[PDB]
Structures are given as C-alpha cells and as structure tokens.
Amino acid sequence: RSAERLTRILDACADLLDEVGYDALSTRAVALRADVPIGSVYRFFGNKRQMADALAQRNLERYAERVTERLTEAGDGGWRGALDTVLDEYLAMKRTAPGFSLIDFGRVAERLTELLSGYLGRRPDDDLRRVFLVAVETADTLVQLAFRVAPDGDEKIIEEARELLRAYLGRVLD
Amino acid sequence: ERLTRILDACADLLDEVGYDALSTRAVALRADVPIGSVYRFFGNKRQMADALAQRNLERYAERVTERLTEAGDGGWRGALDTVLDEYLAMKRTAPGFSLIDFGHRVAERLTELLSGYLGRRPDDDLRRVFLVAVETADTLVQLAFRVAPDGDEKIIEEARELLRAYLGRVL
C-alpha cells in the first residue's frame, strides 16, 4: 500500500507536469491531486527533484518493458524492426505518456545497449557501445528537434531521423 | 573598434567564467571600455552574446568559403569535411566558442553557402536535410568534447561516418 501510494504520487506528478510544468509543480499539489496524505509525499521525497527522478526512472523501466515485449512478440532478430520498435515506442511515450515532454528518462544508451545487443545476437564491445551511444544521442536530438518544429512531432523530421539512423546502422553494423 | 573589443572580451570571459557568471560590467572592464559604451550597443548580455555568435558565424562562413574556393572539387564529401573540420578547429581554437558558438540560422546559412556549390536546389528538402545534419553534428561534437577535452576522436569519426551515411543516401 506504501507502493500503491507511490504509484499514485508519481501519476499525479506526471499529470501535474503537463498542466503547470516543473517550476510551478509542488509537493502539496501532487499529494492533493493523488489523493494521498500530504505526509506520505514528504516521507517519500526530499524535494521536487527527487520525485521527478523517480518518475524518470519509472518512465525508463516502462519503456524497457514495452520494447522488450514488442521485440519478444513480433521481433524477427533484425536491426530494422529493432530500430522501429525503440524509436516508435519512444515516440508514443513522447506523445502519450504523461509529463514525458518535461520528464523523459532524466544510462539510456547503456540500458538499450544491453537490451538490444542481447536481442540482435551481437557482442557489446567498445565499438558497438559507441555506435549505440551515437545512435541514441542523435535520435534524442532529432526527436527533440521534431517536437520543437511541430508540437506533436514533425513527421518529416521524424522520417529524416529514421532514414539517417538506418543509413548509419546499415553502414556500421557488420 | 569598441564593438570589436567588447565581443573579444565577451568571448574570453565566457571561456574564463562561463555564461551566467558573465556580466556586462566584467566585459567592459576586460575590454578597457566604459560600462556605458556596452549599453550603447546592447541592452543586455543575451544581445551581446548573440552579437558574438553572429560574428562567429560570419568568420566560420568565410573560412568555409575560402577553404572550398581554394581546394573544393564540387563534391559533397569535401564540403562535409570542410564544414565539419572548420567547426572543430573553432571549438578548439576560437574564444568562447565552446560556451557560445552559433547562437535554423546555421542550417539556413549552410544551405545558402553550399547549395549553389553542390548544384543542389535550395528547396525545403535540402533545408531539412541540412537542419538534421547540423543538429546531429552539434550533439555529436558536444558529446565528443564531453568525453575528452580535445574532442574524442572515435566519437568525431562515428559522427563523420554517420553524416557520410546519411548524406550519401539522401543527396
């Protein structure tokens, strides 16, 4: 039930992020929205930043579960589908997951390197860890770009990023 | 005269103090100009910093143009190399350029500078390709200087492979 309250605190924190943003956010508003004793929230989190980190952390586990289950159900072992899955699930969260434009995953490249290299039957050496870091950093910047260009994510920017990443992985993946 | 030294002082101080510790007072002091002279050109540090960035861009563009006119062959690979190598030389050598570099504006400028050179029409597609390429390169170069203070060469090379892979498909 302590865990039940945490879920709710984090959900309210996610929702509040979309409504008033990070600066206006306060611990009392979260507790009222979550319908939790205000003392619970102060007990769980030292400041707002800590609550935001727990939310970010929860975003990443959810994304990792989503991707792991898409790859498990319909993956064919290939990097094109793997790439579409990670990118599309991240785009869906970006559009659909509360507070996600403000609080992302906060590490990600590491988690994705583990996840994907297992799936692809590839040895995560330095070269491959670098490729992944490069891919993840560029996808982050291009996704951010797409959403500055149009509020739901400019489709042409997104499609350029997809093409860009396919060309790169097509070139560097042996 | 005074404008030049104000921007020189702004560029250095950036490097010595960082952006938000940077103040109009400190720049005037460094530039050997009355504080009032700074306010004659700029109402605030953000305008001052954008002015510096605009100067950076003019210099970058003239270096690129000179390099391309001297030894360019009309091909996208040497243009990519020039454009990327000149930016990297500036990150390492140009004052303040790590903390304020170019201030769309870069992408638009490169489109103008490079579209005639390459025989490519400056349409919306080319603009978008350049915008994606600039944003990518910017993040990847930031990444490279985060991993080593001279710019991590293996990151730099991945970025170069990545941009060649993209442009070769898309051009």
mmCIF file of C-alpha atoms in Angstrom:
data_model
loop_
_atom_site.group_PDB
_atom_site.id
_atom_site.type_symbol
_atom_site.label_atom_id
_atom_site.label_comp_id
_atom_site.label_asym_id
_atom_site.label_seq_id
_atom_site.Cartn_x
_atom_site.Cartn_y
_atom_site.Cartn_z
ATOM 1 C CA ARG A 1 0.000 0.000 0.000
ATOM 2 C CA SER A 2 3.026 2.153 0.511
ATOM 3 C CA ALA A 3 3.768 1.055 -3.120
ATOM 4 C CA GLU A 4 0.154 1.841 -4.105
ATOM 5 C CA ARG A 5 0.583 5.446 -2.850
ATOM 6 C CA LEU A 6 3.928 5.851 -4.636
ATOM 7 C CA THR A 7 2.346 4.851 -7.945
ATOM 8 C CA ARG A 8 -0.370 7.442 -7.377
ATOM 9 C CA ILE A 9 2.062 10.154 -6.287
ATOM 10 C CA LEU A 10 4.101 9.548 -9.451
ATOM 11 C CA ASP A 11 0.976 9.507 -11.687
ATOM 12 C CA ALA A 12 -0.187 12.834 -10.137
ATOM 13 C CA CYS A 13 3.297 14.245 -10.515
ATOM 14 C CA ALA A 14 3.245 13.133 -14.224
ATOM 15 C CA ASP A 15 -0.185 14.799 -14.817
ATOM 16 C CA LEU A 16 0.784 17.979 -12.979
ATOM 17 C CA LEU A 17 3.932 18.273 -15.139
ATOM 18 C CA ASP A 18 1.736 18.520 -18.274
ATOM 19 C CA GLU A 19 -0.623 21.014 -16.672
ATOM 20 C CA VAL A 20 1.558 23.562 -14.877
ATOM 21 C CA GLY A 21 5.143 22.461 -15.611
ATOM 22 C CA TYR A 22 8.225 21.802 -13.489
ATOM 23 C CA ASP A 23 8.644 25.163 -11.718
ATOM 24 C CA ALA A 24 5.004 25.555 -10.666
ATOM 25 C CA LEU A 25 4.891 21.920 -9.508
ATOM 26 C CA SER A 26 4.775 21.493 -5.761
ATOM 27 C CA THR A 27 4.685 18.584 -3.385
ATOM 28 C CA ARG A 28 1.343 19.602 -1.780
ATOM 29 C CA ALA A 29 -0.460 19.918 -5.161
ATOM 30 C CA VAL A 30 0.787 16.419 -6.059
ATOM 31 C CA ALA A 31 -0.494 14.954 -2.782
ATOM 32 C CA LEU A 32 -3.928 16.637 -3.242
ATOM 33 C CA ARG A 33 -4.228 15.517 -6.843
ATOM 34 C CA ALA A 34 -3.013 11.964 -5.967
ATOM 35 C CA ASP A 35 -5.433 11.948 -3.036
ATOM 36 C CA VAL A 36 -2.714 10.880 -0.657
ATOM 37 C CA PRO A 37 -1.945 12.117 2.876
ATOM 38 C CA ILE A 38 0.455 15.031 2.261
ATOM 39 C CA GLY A 39 2.796 13.455 4.841
ATOM 40 C CA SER A 40 3.316 10.422 2.551
ATOM 41 C CA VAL A 41 4.822 12.582 -0.186
ATOM 42 C CA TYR A 42 7.200 14.425 2.220
ATOM 43 C CA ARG A 43 8.109 10.963 3.613
ATOM 44 C CA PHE A 44 8.838 9.518 0.155
ATOM 45 C CA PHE A 45 10.649 12.511 -1.385
ATOM 46 C CA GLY A 46 13.085 15.101 -0.010
ATOM 47 C CA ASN A 47 12.399 17.632 -2.763
ATOM 48 C CA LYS A 48 10.535 18.022 -6.053
ATOM 49 C CA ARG A 49 13.692 16.977 -7.960
ATOM 50 C CA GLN A 50 13.761 13.555 -6.186
ATOM 51 C CA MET A 51 10.097 12.893 -7.161
ATOM 52 C CA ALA A 52 10.938 13.891 -10.738
ATOM 53 C CA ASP A 53 13.869 11.402 -10.746
ATOM 54 C CA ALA A 54 11.647 8.553 -9.515
ATOM 55 C CA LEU A 55 9.201 9.420 -12.311
ATOM 56 C CA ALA A 56 12.012 9.473 -14.893
ATOM 57 C CA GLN A 57 13.281 6.153 -13.526
ATOM 58 C CA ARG A 58 9.771 4.687 -13.796
ATOM 59 C CA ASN A 59 9.483 6.024 -17.387
ATOM 60 C CA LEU A 60 12.634 4.113 -18.326
ATOM 61 C CA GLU A 61 11.525 0.813 -16.825
ATOM 62 C CA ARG A 62 8.175 1.099 -18.612
ATOM 63 C CA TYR A 63 9.874 1.914 -21.908
ATOM 64 C CA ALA A 64 12.294 -1.019 -21.409
ATOM 65 C CA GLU A 65 9.354 -3.370 -20.656
ATOM 66 C CA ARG A 66 7.423 -2.068 -23.718
ATOM 67 C CA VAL A 67 10.369 -2.562 -26.047
ATOM 68 C CA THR A 68 11.295 -5.970 -24.531
ATOM 69 C CA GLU A 69 7.686 -7.170 -25.103
ATOM 70 C CA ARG A 70 7.391 -5.782 -28.710
ATOM 71 C CA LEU A 71 10.697 -7.430 -29.647
ATOM 72 C CA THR A 72 9.604 -10.682 -27.918
ATOM 73 C CA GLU A 73 6.222 -10.842 -29.656
ATOM 74 C CA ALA A 74 6.952 -9.731 -33.176
ATOM 75 C CA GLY A 75 10.718 -9.267 -33.491
ATOM 76 C CA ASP A 76 12.495 -11.188 -36.253
ATOM 77 C CA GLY A 77 16.070 -10.764 -34.854
ATOM 78 C CA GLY A 78 16.817 -7.890 -37.333
ATOM 79 C CA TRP A 79 18.036 -4.384 -36.579
ATOM 80 C CA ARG A 80 15.393 -2.553 -38.789
ATOM 81 C CA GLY A 81 12.476 -3.823 -36.701
ATOM 82 C CA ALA A 82 14.536 -3.358 -33.510
ATOM 83 C CA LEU A 83 15.154 0.298 -34.526
ATOM 84 C CA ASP A 84 11.474 0.851 -35.432
ATOM 85 C CA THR A 85 10.426 -0.585 -32.049
ATOM 86 C CA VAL A 86 12.699 1.552 -29.877
ATOM 87 C CA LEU A 87 12.044 4.698 -31.836
ATOM 88 C CA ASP A 88 8.238 4.179 -32.188
ATOM 89 C CA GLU A 89 7.738 3.267 -28.541
ATOM 90 C CA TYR A 90 9.742 6.320 -27.557
ATOM 91 C CA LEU A 91 7.658 8.471 -29.937
ATOM 92 C CA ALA A 92 4.426 7.019 -28.476
ATOM 93 C CA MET A 93 5.553 7.772 -24.928
ATOM 94 C CA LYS A 94 6.655 11.252 -26.045
ATOM 95 C CA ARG A 95 3.102 11.865 -27.320
ATOM 96 C CA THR A 96 1.065 9.702 -24.953
ATOM 97 C CA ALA A 97 2.882 9.260 -21.605
ATOM 98 C CA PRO A 98 2.035 11.980 -19.022
ATOM 99 C CA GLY A 99 4.713 14.553 -18.225
ATOM 100 C CA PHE A 100 7.001 12.915 -20.783
ATOM 101 C CA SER A 101 7.934 16.069 -22.732
ATOM 102 C CA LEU A 102 9.115 17.635 -19.421
ATOM 103 C CA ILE A 103 10.495 14.500 -17.754
ATOM 104 C CA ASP A 104 11.999 11.978 -20.084
ATOM 105 C CA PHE A 105 14.338 9.386 -18.680
ATOM 106 C CA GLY A 106 16.076 12.162 -16.736
ATOM 107 C CA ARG A 107 22.210 5.446 -18.863
ATOM 108 C CA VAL A 108 19.557 5.073 -21.566
ATOM 109 C CA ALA A 109 22.202 4.087 -24.117
ATOM 110 C CA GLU A 110 23.525 1.512 -21.636
ATOM 111 C CA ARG A 111 20.088 0.089 -20.953
ATOM 112 C CA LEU A 112 19.370 -0.003 -24.698
ATOM 113 C CA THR A 113 22.790 -1.446 -25.474
ATOM 114 C CA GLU A 114 22.083 -4.328 -23.069
ATOM 115 C CA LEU A 115 18.556 -4.819 -24.223
ATOM 116 C CA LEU A 116 19.269 -4.696 -27.960
ATOM 117 C CA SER A 117 22.606 -6.452 -28.191
ATOM 118 C CA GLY A 118 21.157 -9.499 -26.445
ATOM 119 C CA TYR A 119 18.243 -9.420 -28.907
ATOM 120 C CA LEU A 120 20.403 -8.923 -32.017
ATOM 121 C CA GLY A 121 22.955 -11.622 -31.128
ATOM 122 C CA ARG A 122 25.814 -9.068 -31.154
ATOM 123 C CA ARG A 123 28.778 -8.701 -28.777
ATOM 124 C CA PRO A 124 28.620 -5.372 -26.946
ATOM 125 C CA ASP A 125 32.321 -4.383 -27.356
ATOM 126 C CA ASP A 126 33.569 -0.768 -27.294
ATOM 127 C CA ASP A 127 32.795 -0.232 -30.963
ATOM 128 C CA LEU A 128 29.207 -1.324 -30.590
ATOM 129 C CA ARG A 129 28.710 0.550 -27.291
ATOM 130 C CA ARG A 130 29.961 3.642 -29.154
ATOM 131 C CA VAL A 131 27.595 3.057 -32.118
ATOM 132 C CA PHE A 132 24.667 2.830 -29.687
ATOM 133 C CA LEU A 133 25.654 5.864 -27.708
ATOM 134 C CA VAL A 134 25.972 7.795 -31.017
ATOM 135 C CA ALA A 135 22.597 6.488 -32.300
ATOM 136 C CA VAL A 136 20.750 7.207 -29.034
ATOM 137 C CA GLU A 137 22.221 10.703 -28.679
ATOM 138 C CA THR A 138 21.282 11.548 -32.268
ATOM 139 C CA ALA A 139 17.772 10.122 -32.011
ATOM 140 C CA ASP A 140 17.228 12.126 -28.808
ATOM 141 C CA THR A 141 18.373 15.366 -30.513
ATOM 142 C CA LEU A 142 16.312 14.713 -33.647
ATOM 143 C CA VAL A 143 13.181 13.745 -31.742
ATOM 144 C CA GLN A 144 13.602 16.976 -29.652
ATOM 145 C CA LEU A 145 14.027 18.884 -32.919
ATOM 146 C CA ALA A 146 10.820 17.310 -34.382
ATOM 147 C CA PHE A 147 8.796 18.448 -31.370
ATOM 148 C CA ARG A 148 10.162 21.977 -31.458
ATOM 149 C CA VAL A 149 9.233 22.143 -35.159
ATOM 150 C CA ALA A 150 5.662 20.850 -34.565
ATOM 151 C CA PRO A 151 4.070 20.195 -31.122
ATOM 152 C CA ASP A 152 3.105 16.545 -31.837
ATOM 153 C CA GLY A 153 6.455 15.893 -33.543
ATOM 154 C CA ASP A 154 7.070 16.915 -37.135
ATOM 155 C CA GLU A 155 6.664 13.788 -39.258
ATOM 156 C CA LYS A 156 9.176 14.825 -41.894
ATOM 157 C CA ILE A 157 11.875 15.402 -39.240
ATOM 158 C CA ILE A 158 10.990 12.038 -37.703
ATOM 159 C CA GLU A 159 11.223 10.348 -41.115
ATOM 160 C CA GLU A 160 14.609 12.033 -41.783
ATOM 161 C CA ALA A 161 15.818 10.686 -38.394
ATOM 162 C CA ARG A 162 14.586 7.212 -39.278
ATOM 163 C CA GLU A 163 16.408 7.360 -42.642
ATOM 164 C CA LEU A 164 19.535 8.836 -41.000
ATOM 165 C CA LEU A 165 19.649 6.048 -38.359
ATOM 166 C CA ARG A 166 19.009 3.274 -40.920
ATOM 167 C CA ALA A 167 21.820 4.564 -43.179
ATOM 168 C CA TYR A 168 24.202 4.723 -40.218
ATOM 169 C CA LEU A 169 23.355 1.308 -38.793
ATOM 170 C CA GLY A 170 23.276 -0.153 -42.314
ATOM 171 C CA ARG A 171 26.826 1.222 -42.798
ATOM 172 C CA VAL A 172 28.393 0.397 -39.372
ATOM 173 C CA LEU A 173 26.693 -2.865 -38.361
ATOM 174 C CA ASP A 174 28.788 -5.757 -39.669
ATOM 175 C CA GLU B 1 36.797 49.484 -32.679
ATOM 176 C CA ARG B 2 34.927 49.396 -29.322
ATOM 177 C CA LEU B 3 32.358 46.864 -30.557
ATOM 178 C CA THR B 4 35.186 44.505 -31.602
ATOM 179 C CA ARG B 5 36.935 44.600 -28.286
ATOM 180 C CA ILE B 6 33.666 44.209 -26.422
ATOM 181 C CA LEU B 7 32.945 40.947 -28.307
ATOM 182 C CA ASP B 8 36.620 39.788 -27.863
ATOM 183 C CA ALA B 9 36.226 40.366 -24.141
ATOM 184 C CA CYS B 10 32.816 38.605 -24.109
ATOM 185 C CA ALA B 11 34.301 35.585 -25.955
ATOM 186 C CA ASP B 12 37.226 35.278 -23.473
ATOM 187 C CA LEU B 13 35.189 35.843 -20.337
ATOM 188 C CA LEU B 14 32.755 33.149 -21.481
ATOM 189 C CA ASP B 15 35.764 30.803 -21.524
ATOM 190 C CA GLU B 16 37.078 32.030 -18.176
ATOM 191 C CA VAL B 17 33.833 32.497 -16.196
ATOM 192 C CA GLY B 18 31.009 30.689 -18.071
ATOM 193 C CA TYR B 19 27.785 32.205 -19.460
ATOM 194 C CA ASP B 20 25.631 33.056 -16.435
ATOM 195 C CA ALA B 21 28.507 34.353 -14.337
ATOM 196 C CA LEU B 22 29.332 36.570 -17.325
ATOM 197 C CA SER B 23 28.277 40.188 -16.812
ATOM 198 C CA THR B 24 28.249 43.366 -18.839
ATOM 199 C CA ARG B 25 30.454 45.023 -16.140
ATOM 200 C CA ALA B 26 33.163 42.363 -16.364
ATOM 201 C CA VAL B 27 33.210 42.613 -20.180
ATOM 202 C CA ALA B 28 33.580 46.432 -20.126
ATOM 203 C CA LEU B 29 36.400 46.077 -17.597
ATOM 204 C CA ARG B 30 38.142 43.416 -19.723
ATOM 205 C CA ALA B 31 37.535 45.418 -22.908
ATOM 206 C CA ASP B 32 39.002 48.701 -21.474
ATOM 207 C CA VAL B 33 35.721 50.492 -22.203
ATOM 208 C CA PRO B 34 33.290 52.410 -20.000
ATOM 209 C CA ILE B 35 30.308 50.234 -18.953
ATOM 210 C CA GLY B 36 28.104 52.810 -20.742
ATOM 211 C CA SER B 37 29.709 52.020 -24.080
ATOM 212 C CA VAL B 38 28.495 48.429 -23.780
ATOM 213 C CA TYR B 39 24.907 49.621 -23.211
ATOM 214 C CA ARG B 40 25.174 51.833 -26.313
ATOM 215 C CA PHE B 41 25.293 48.645 -28.465
ATOM 216 C CA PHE B 42 23.474 46.045 -26.392
ATOM 217 C CA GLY B 43 20.727 46.372 -23.837
ATOM 218 C CA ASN B 44 21.703 43.069 -22.230
ATOM 219 C CA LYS B 45 24.166 40.158 -22.087
ATOM 220 C CA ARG B 46 21.926 37.917 -24.280
ATOM 221 C CA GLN B 47 22.039 40.503 -27.142
ATOM 222 C CA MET B 48 25.769 40.862 -26.517
ATOM 223 C CA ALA B 49 26.211 37.045 -26.662
ATOM 224 C CA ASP B 50 24.052 36.782 -29.805
ATOM 225 C CA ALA B 51 26.157 39.513 -31.440
ATOM 226 C CA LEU B 52 29.287 37.467 -30.653
ATOM 227 C CA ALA B 53 27.602 34.349 -32.080
ATOM 228 C CA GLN B 54 26.737 36.295 -35.207
ATOM 229 C CA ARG B 55 30.390 37.230 -35.580
ATOM 230 C CA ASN B 56 31.440 33.583 -35.063
ATOM 231 C CA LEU B 57 29.100 32.547 -37.857
ATOM 232 C CA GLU B 58 30.461 35.188 -40.293
ATOM 233 C CA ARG B 59 34.007 34.030 -39.554
ATOM 234 C CA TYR B 60 33.043 30.352 -39.862
ATOM 235 C CA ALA B 61 31.288 31.007 -43.184
ATOM 236 C CA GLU B 62 34.265 32.944 -44.566
ATOM 237 C CA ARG B 63 36.690 30.191 -43.522
ATOM 238 C CA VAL B 64 34.442 27.555 -45.099
ATOM 239 C CA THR B 65 34.050 29.603 -48.320
ATOM 240 C CA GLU B 66 37.800 30.218 -48.541
ATOM 241 C CA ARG B 67 38.618 26.541 -47.949
ATOM 242 C CA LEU B 68 36.052 25.460 -50.531
ATOM 243 C CA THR B 69 37.196 28.041 -53.135
ATOM 244 C CA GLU B 70 40.885 27.135 -52.637
ATOM 245 C CA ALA B 71 40.620 23.301 -52.813
ATOM 246 C CA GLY B 72 37.000 22.326 -53.300
ATOM 247 C CA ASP B 73 36.045 19.923 -56.114
ATOM 248 C CA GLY B 74 32.279 20.444 -56.075
ATOM 249 C CA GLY B 75 31.573 17.179 -54.185
ATOM 250 C CA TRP B 76 29.562 16.692 -51.005
ATOM 251 C CA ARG B 77 32.366 14.771 -49.180
ATOM 252 C CA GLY B 78 34.939 17.554 -49.188
ATOM 253 C CA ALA B 79 32.199 20.059 -48.279
ATOM 254 C CA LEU B 80 31.191 17.859 -45.307
ATOM 255 C CA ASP B 81 34.822 17.527 -44.261
ATOM 256 C CA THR B 82 35.483 21.296 -44.559
ATOM 257 C CA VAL B 83 32.288 22.274 -42.864
ATOM 258 C CA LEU B 84 32.907 19.792 -40.035
ATOM 259 C CA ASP B 85 36.722 20.335 -39.681
ATOM 260 C CA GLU B 86 36.398 24.159 -39.583
ATOM 261 C CA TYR B 87 33.781 23.912 -36.886
ATOM 262 C CA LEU B 88 36.022 21.571 -34.870
ATOM 263 C CA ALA B 89 39.032 23.891 -35.333
ATOM 264 C CA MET B 90 36.889 26.709 -33.915
ATOM 265 C CA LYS B 91 35.604 24.654 -30.989
ATOM 266 C CA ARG B 92 39.288 24.096 -30.046
ATOM 267 C CA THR B 93 40.774 27.466 -31.010
ATOM 268 C CA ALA B 94 38.075 30.157 -31.114
ATOM 269 C CA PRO B 95 37.478 32.102 -27.823
ATOM 270 C CA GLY B 96 34.074 31.421 -26.164
ATOM 271 C CA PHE B 97 33.018 29.083 -28.995
ATOM 272 C CA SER B 98 32.560 26.096 -26.633
ATOM 273 C CA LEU B 99 30.039 28.096 -24.492
ATOM 274 C CA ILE B 100 28.539 30.191 -27.312
ATOM 275 C CA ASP B 101 29.087 29.030 -30.856
ATOM 276 C CA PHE B 102 26.413 29.982 -33.426
ATOM 277 C CA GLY B 103 23.609 31.408 -31.229
ATOM 278 C CA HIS B 104 17.937 27.051 -38.377
ATOM 279 C CA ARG B 105 20.346 30.056 -38.515
ATOM 280 C CA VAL B 106 23.361 27.741 -39.103
ATOM 281 C CA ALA B 107 21.362 25.391 -41.335
ATOM 282 C CA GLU B 108 19.929 28.273 -43.429
ATOM 283 C CA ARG B 109 23.408 29.749 -43.799
ATOM 284 C CA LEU B 110 24.964 26.476 -44.840
ATOM 285 C CA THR B 111 22.086 25.964 -47.307
ATOM 286 C CA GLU B 112 22.908 29.318 -48.923
ATOM 287 C CA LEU B 113 26.643 28.714 -48.808
ATOM 288 C CA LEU B 114 26.555 25.156 -50.073
ATOM 289 C CA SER B 115 23.535 24.703 -52.341
ATOM 290 C CA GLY B 116 24.989 26.525 -55.371
ATOM 291 C CA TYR B 117 28.413 24.971 -54.714
ATOM 292 C CA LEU B 118 26.964 21.452 -54.818
ATOM 293 C CA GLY B 119 24.466 22.043 -57.693
ATOM 294 C CA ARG B 120 21.549 21.273 -55.450
ATOM 295 C CA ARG B 121 18.415 23.297 -55.377
ATOM 296 C CA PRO B 122 17.845 25.213 -52.124
ATOM 297 C CA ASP B 123 14.380 23.685 -51.621
ATOM 298 C CA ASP B 124 12.586 22.577 -48.448
ATOM 299 C CA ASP B 125 14.019 19.049 -48.649
ATOM 300 C CA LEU B 126 17.605 20.295 -48.801
ATOM 301 C CA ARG B 127 16.858 22.744 -45.956
ATOM 302 C CA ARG B 128 15.501 19.867 -43.847
ATOM 303 C CA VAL B 129 18.452 17.593 -44.674
ATOM 304 C CA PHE B 130 20.881 20.368 -43.579
ATOM 305 C CA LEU B 131 18.892 21.130 -40.440
ATOM 306 C CA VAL B 132 19.036 17.442 -39.421
ATOM 307 C CA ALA B 133 22.729 17.264 -40.248
ATOM 308 C CA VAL B 134 23.605 20.388 -38.221
ATOM 309 C CA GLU B 135 21.589 19.281 -35.195
ATOM 310 C CA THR B 136 23.152 15.850 -35.317
ATOM 311 C CA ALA B 137 26.647 17.226 -35.742
ATOM 312 C CA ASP B 138 26.146 19.690 -32.918
ATOM 313 C CA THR B 139 25.054 16.996 -30.427
ATOM 314 C CA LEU B 140 27.790 14.619 -31.560
ATOM 315 C CA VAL B 141 30.516 17.227 -31.242
ATOM 316 C CA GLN B 142 29.195 18.256 -27.802
ATOM 317 C CA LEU B 143 29.315 14.532 -26.885
ATOM 318 C CA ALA B 144 32.944 14.239 -28.235
ATOM 319 C CA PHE B 145 34.166 17.169 -26.055
ATOM 320 C CA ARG B 146 32.369 15.769 -23.056
ATOM 321 C CA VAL B 147 34.316 12.528 -23.312
ATOM 322 C CA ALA B 148 37.740 14.157 -23.886
ATOM 323 C CA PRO B 149 38.662 17.889 -23.643
ATOM 324 C CA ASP B 150 40.293 17.883 -27.085
ATOM 325 C CA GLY B 151 37.211 16.211 -28.632
ATOM 326 C CA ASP B 152 37.113 12.397 -28.581
ATOM 327 C CA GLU B 153 38.447 11.215 -31.960
ATOM 328 C CA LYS B 154 36.462 7.968 -32.062
ATOM 329 C CA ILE B 155 33.226 9.926 -31.452
ATOM 330 C CA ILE B 156 34.299 12.508 -34.085
ATOM 331 C CA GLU B 157 34.892 9.632 -36.598
ATOM 332 C CA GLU B 158 31.489 7.966 -35.869
ATOM 333 C CA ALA B 159 29.848 11.324 -36.458
ATOM 334 C CA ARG B 160 31.728 11.643 -39.750
ATOM 335 C CA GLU B 161 30.676 8.086 -40.760
ATOM 336 C CA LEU B 162 27.143 8.780 -39.645
ATOM 337 C CA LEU B 163 26.934 12.044 -41.680
ATOM 338 C CA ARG B 164 28.504 10.443 -44.770
ATOM 339 C CA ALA B 165 25.997 7.562 -44.441
ATOM 340 C CA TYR B 166 23.084 9.992 -44.218
ATOM 341 C CA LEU B 167 24.163 12.448 -46.932
ATOM 342 C CA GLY B 168 25.203 9.726 -49.398
ATOM 343 C CA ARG B 169 21.731 8.131 -49.092
ATOM 344 C CA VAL B 170 19.859 11.418 -49.153
ATOM 345 C CA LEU B 171 21.751 13.509 -51.721
#
